[PDB]
Design a protein around this nucleic acid. Structure first.
Lengths: 92, 97, 67, 91, 82, 67, 78, 95, 104, 92
DNA sequence: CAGGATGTATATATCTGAGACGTCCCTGGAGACTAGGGAGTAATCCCCTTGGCGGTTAAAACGCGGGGGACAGCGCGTACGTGCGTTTAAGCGGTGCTAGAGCTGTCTACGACCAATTGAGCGGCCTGGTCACGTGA
DNA sequence: TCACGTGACCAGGCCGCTCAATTGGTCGTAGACAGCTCTAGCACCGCTTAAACGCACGTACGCGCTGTCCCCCGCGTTTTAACCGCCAAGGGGATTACTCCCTAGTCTCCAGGGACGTCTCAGATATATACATCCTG
């Protein structure tokens, strides 16, 4: 049983363009993009933890990895979304 | 009753899968509670941006679907994604006019 | 054998109508997916133009009468 | 002279299909791999992936070569243009 | 088991690649140069591809082997896996 | 068995488009040609209505600017 | 500021490069290029510094920025 | 006495390709570095080792770029480097 | 006895075993992996040191300074490409004057 | 207590040249070189083990990694060096 | 093409920090024992790789003439180089001072583990939604 | 000519299940926060002087224009082999299962390597001269 983000790209796509569809190869490319950025951020977080002799990868690590991995405005929006999601998670 | 983490954070990407990949991937000895949520929100935002730009690119044409051509056009047209994906080759994407 | 002739004339018919419909959609990009959608958009546009033309002529008449 | 060169140019740029023939590329790839391990087998998707990578590389190298040719106040690309492109790019 | 294959990248194929890059005139010597460049590139990628193949104790070179070889060279590729 | 539903929906849609172009032709009584020619008529008439609307807007805006 | 990177400095760098004579306009272009390079590296240096809860920029931060950008620098404790 | 144009340039090339010292002034470079850093966080302190690593990286980068610029100028049949040459080098290298 | 001596090396096999174990590379590090890595690293260090010492003797010096390391790396066609993306402090550059700039 | 390869680099130098010395900056450069090559080989070996669904980084992972990382003649000689070391270790 | 002018390469005391060596030590690697979890080998099996045969057709290959664009040459007019004088800042060594780097230590909160329960999501069968075509009067 | 039965292509719904996610509790440790030492980053200063700034004069080359001609591009014709489908066999990767041996974890102990001190000599500064290279007439 393969693991993919296909269902999640469907759900995210229909939100902005309900009537638009996605081709199979397009879904493959999008999955590869998601996995690539995941690996980039995870590696940078691992390096950040290693440099500070720290054993835990936390939200600060992901935030700094995003600041390092994405360009200016895109990184700003990513940081905003991450902080918002973390806040919504903890608030209860 | 049970509630998925993505539902608590208000996300569509699976927090659980990302968290499993974070521990199992040999990135660190311990993984914090808030790492998966931040990471998943970031990934979701980037996917949403790709999808919006690609939908616009396909709407420039009359096509009803996104084919690798439109993903290519979306990535190259925008300086942001172009810098981020400066070394990424998209199969069947060709080149801009 | 001559049925092939009918075949390419039908193909040309389909091509021409599809080209015209594409011209419509380029003129009215509101909806393009389904023929019914294009027709409905064009009909709404035509009704709007007709109403606006009536209003414009009637306002011009009042403008001329008052000045 | 060169009037339909632009026709070919924008025709190919607009499209997104392959340009090098398939079987020749497959045979070249097999011959190349033979020097590394004999009796080798290739997954078809692997061959197509190699073809996509190679076409992308050649297209990019040719854009760089064209920039070099224009820099020389020429419109024809010549071997020294490709050489300059590769040398600058670290290859 | 065959030779003379590098000639399979014919003149028109090189022409089409050049035009897609925006070149509007080419010389006759470009064709051998581009054949040599493609040969070098393909050898360099297939080296690592066959390395990844042999390591896993497999007789078939999988498309993922090509994907990771290209990534290791820094030329990541989206569409065939990963 | 399953064929019947599919063909009935196809009939429903195609006759719906037919009746739609029929109501348009009732709103567009200028060509009364065949279906493809009538679609061409719709295209041209919509184009000319748009251009006529813009032209009247421009010319009467000039008249307003005059006074 | 940038003007402290004088014309003779650029000439010296280029001579180590191998140029015989220099266009009068290379100087401003070189200043711009160096400013961009410095900004790009210093951003990541300050990012690492901020992450470490520090307020001093350390040589390892610069080494990490350079290693990140594919410009690995040996000789400063990396 | 007066050397003909070009002799001193080659002498300088030979000298600076033999030698290994830094070429930009240290205090002006440090001032530039601090001015740049002012736009990311205020009141940053800098280690001497950090400033020196920055200067070494910058000098090496500029020297390599000028080598490419010289190559491009020669390809253009000239002997002088012009801003078009730097632009071509940077465009091909990907920046 | 020392495991480094047990395997006929000089580099710290145990230190490398600890580095691999705790450096977040895998859940498990095999016994022979640190030995292999220590041997390879020792060979590379020996090769570069030998070339740099040759450069120092060719320059009539007794100590290796970054200039000699740069000369050793950049003159060697393979130790160069292994380090083509690396800059070495106080390394300078190899002499290179293009023929087109030569007098006359 | 900072670790370092200084002693080992010094001994390897003297194993072939009786009187050559290493300055402090050259010592740092060589140490950083050794650490960089360690990181390259180890990261590649970890990726190889992950790809093959293995939880163990063995000497064969290091052999494949050293072939990928190093160029031709260096790869061959380093492979021979590693195999001799491992054989002497296992035989005793 | 010889001769002078500047320059780079060769051969000597003084000194001086910075490599190099001896010592204290302390902490991390080596020896021993353990338990189970991954690696490893064997047997299955089904996909998908290779191989072959024909026809059709697209594409490639070859030839030919006519530009037009590479390449070479001559004239020139300024932009860059070289050089001398003035001056501006860098560089250096010293003195003070305090922010902040680095380390220690309780001491809580949080993350790893296990067991348990269960819902998300993959896959497959199936139903409607869509365009487009071949058919008949 | 007008108008219309039917099938590729696809989205979505729905269920089976099944395999990882969520929940709850226990136990240990890492890192947070408080606190202390004290390194070095920063501020200012005076003095020596090496590099920088500016301006002057000249000629070398970047550039423009103008010619020659060669070789590339477009197009017509022959041919060749790619490609599409379609059928065969099989071998090689994906998978399941079980055995067992290799490695992670814990405990003890002590010498291998790091930190700190002191010391002389290899390199730097300075000076002297020997041959080389360049530019003039």
């Amino acid at each position: 049983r393969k693991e993919t983000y296909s269902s999640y790209i469907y759900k995210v796509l229909k939100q902005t363009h309900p009537d638009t569809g996605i081709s199979q190869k397009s879904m493959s490319i999008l999955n590869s993009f998601v996995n690539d950025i995941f690996e980039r951020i995870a590696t940078e977080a691992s390096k950040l933890a290693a440099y500070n002799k720290k054993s835990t990868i936390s939200a600060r690590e992901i935030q700094t990895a995003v600041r390092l991995i994405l360009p200016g405005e895109l990184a700003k929006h990513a940081v905003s979304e991450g902080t918002r999601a973390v806040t919504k998670y903890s608030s209860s | 009753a049970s509630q998925s983490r993505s539902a608590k954070a208000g996300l569509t990407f699976p927090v659980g899968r990302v968290h499993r990949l974070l521990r199992r991937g040999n990135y660190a000895q311990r993984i914090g509670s808030g790492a998966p949520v931040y990471l998943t929100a970031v990934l979701e935002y980037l996917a949403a941006e790709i999808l919006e730009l690609a939908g616009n690119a396909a709407r420039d044409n009359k096509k009803t679907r996104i084919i690798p051509r439109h993903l290519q056009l979306a990535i190259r047209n925008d300086d942001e994604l172009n810098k981020l994906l400066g070394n990424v080759t998209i199969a069947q994407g060709g080149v801009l006019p | 054998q001559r049925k092939d002739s009918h075949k390419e004339v039908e193909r040309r018919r389909r091509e021409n109508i599809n080209t015209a419909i594409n011209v419509l959609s380029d003129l009215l990009p509101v909806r393009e997916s389904s023929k019914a959608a294009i027709l409905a958009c064009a009909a709404e546009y035509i009704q709007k133009l007709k109403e606006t033309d009536e209003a414009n002529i009637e306002k011009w008449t009042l403008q001329k009468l008052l000045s | 002279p060169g009037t339909v060169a632009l026709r070919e140019i924008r025709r190919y740029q607009k499209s997104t299909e392959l340009l090098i023939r398939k079987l020749p590329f497959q045979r070249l790839v097999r011959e190349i791999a033979q020097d590394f391990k004999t009796d080798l087998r290739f997954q078809s998707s692997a061959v197509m992936a190699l073809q996509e990578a190679s076409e992308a590389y050649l297209v990019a190298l040719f854009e760089d070569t064209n920039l070099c040719a224009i820099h020389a106040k020429r419109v024809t690309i010549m071997p020294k243009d490709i050489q300059l492109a590769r040398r600058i790019r670290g290859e | 088991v065959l030779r003379d294959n590098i000639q399979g990248i014919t003149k028109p194929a090189i022409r089409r690649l050049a035009r897609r890059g925006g070149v509007k005139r080419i010389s006759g010597l470009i064709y051998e140069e581009t054949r040599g460049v493609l040969k070098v590139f393909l050898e360099n990628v297939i080296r690592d591809a066959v390395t990844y193949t042999e390591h896993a104790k497999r007789k078939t070179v999988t498309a993922m082997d090509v994907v990771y070889a290209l990534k290791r060279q820094g030329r990541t590729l989206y569409g065939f896996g990963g």
